Ligand binder design. Structure first.
Ligand code: HEC
Ligand code: HEC
Ligand code: HEC
Length: 68
């Protein structure tokens, strides 16, 4: 997807794939041949999601990605 969504009990998160990529350039979420990253509450909450935001706008204040 260019955009993706993950609905979760702690609130739904939008994923951008293209929309992130326009700033990121793939090899920032990915490295060396991109493929299906193991999204879970081990990866996501490590550098996967909870790193590359504190030096950006939008999500940071815990209640960021997760809406409702
Ligand atoms: C503030 C520090 C946050 C709290 C509290 C929680 N999150 Fe997250 N989160 C993100 C993703 C992509 C996932 C993976 C979905 C999965 O588990 O497969 C999660 C997951 C969780 C979960 C487990 C699911 C549930 O709803 O119970 C919990 C308990 C949870 N998160 C609490 C992404 C992000 C994210 C984007 C950068 C941020 C800022 C946070 N999560 C922050 C919090
Ligand atoms: C972090 C915000 C990402 C950016 C930026 C890019 N990708 Fe990505 N990609 C990401 C995740 C978390 C996943 C797995 C999604 C899931 O929950 O399964 C992926 C997956 C891919 C895949 C396989 C699935 C697909 O959509 O084809 C490929 C081939 C892929 N990603 C390529 C790719 C490229 C070329 C990017 C730059 C334009 C790019 N990704 C950015 C997370 C993120
Ligand atoms: C850098 C390598 C990033 C990674 C890895 C992830 N995200 Fe991200 N995210 C990043 C930036 C630069 C921004 C701000 C965009 C801007 O225009 O400046 C974001 C934004 C988000 C948002 C908010 C989207 C919105 O509603 O405006 C969400 C919901 C978000 N990011 C989620 C998210 C998740 C789930 C990630 C782990 C798979 C993830 N991001 C990785 C930079 C980077």
């Amino acid at each position: 997807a260019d955009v993706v969504t993950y609905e979760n009990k702690k609130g739904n998160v939008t994923f951008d794939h293209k929309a992130h990529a326009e700033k990121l350039g793939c090899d920032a979420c990915h490295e060396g041949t991109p493929a299906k990253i193991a999204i879970d509450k081990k990866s996501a909450h490590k550098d996967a999601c909870k790193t590359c935001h504190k030096s950006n706008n939008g999500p940071t204040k815990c209640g960021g990605c997760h809406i409702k």
